[PDB]
Subunit: 151 residues, 2 copies
């Protein structure tokens, strides 16, 4: 009984809490320009080849690929990727808000892969590329909410 309590303690894997999402850039200043002027992020800090933005929530950051290689030895992508590498998703509170966001973002020069549409996973979504190989999704659940939830 006591040994079991010890066993349970030792084998539990504690899940980490992601605090910062750091995109790999090849042109920091152009990236900073995009997230600030197009998406409304505010600069919080700067270091060599690095900038990040204010919270709340996950901290969005940018770090030059060459600097990552040189300072950490992590082999960050040498050049701009040949396709999209990661997705950053923003849940909105209603499908109709998606169309509003689309028009505001499009007016600021955001280029979308398609106009707003309903998708087979029960969400209304829009998708756009950012300058660090990522794409962004704004989504809102249609009636019935999120499908596929496990029980």
């Amino acid at each position: 009984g006591t040994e079991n309590l010890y066993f349970q303690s030792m084998v539990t894997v504690s899940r980490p809490t992601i605090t910062d999402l750091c995109l790999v850039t090849h042109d920091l200043e152009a990236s900073v320009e995009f997230y600030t002027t197009k998406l409304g992020y505010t600069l919080s800090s700067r270091m060599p080849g690095f900038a990040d933005f204010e919270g709340p929530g996950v901290i969005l950051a940018l770090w030059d690929a060459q600097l990552i290689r040189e300072t950490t030895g992590v082999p960050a992508l040498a050049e701009e990727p040949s396709g999209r590498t990661v997705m950053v998703a923003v849940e909105l509170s209603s499908p109709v808000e998606i169309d509003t966001a689309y028009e505001r973002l499009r007016a600021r020069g955001i280029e979308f892969y398609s106009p707003p549409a309903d998708y087979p996973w029960n969400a209304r979504c829009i998708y756009f590329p950012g300058p660090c190989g990522e794409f962004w999704e704004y989504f809102a659940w249609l009636e019935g909410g999120k499908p596929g939830q496990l029980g």
Copy 2:
């Protein structure tokens, strides 16, 4: 005065709130195995070529590259990337906790680029690749805290 209040309303860019981080995978089941068994994430939902994990905080998700292309037209990377494409960062509460996390993770088969070290940006960090082109950073600030903060 009234016109100015209207102007300020219209030109403010509202910053989005990232709710989900979705990695692009080429082998969903192997990815699911990594995040669950090595990092302690728990499955929350599944859809075709898709799985995500339980909160709190940002929701970690995985989505097959081929399915993204087919269902959204977003040109997700065709194959495994030639280098690291994005960084997921986990802030810990002290430098000494970094060395503890390193030993626990290493014991579970996480492969690190280097053992724990102090870096020139005033943090003690460890870095490891994941199966979706990303790498992970666990970091904790040394005495004096985060450098480069803007005023």
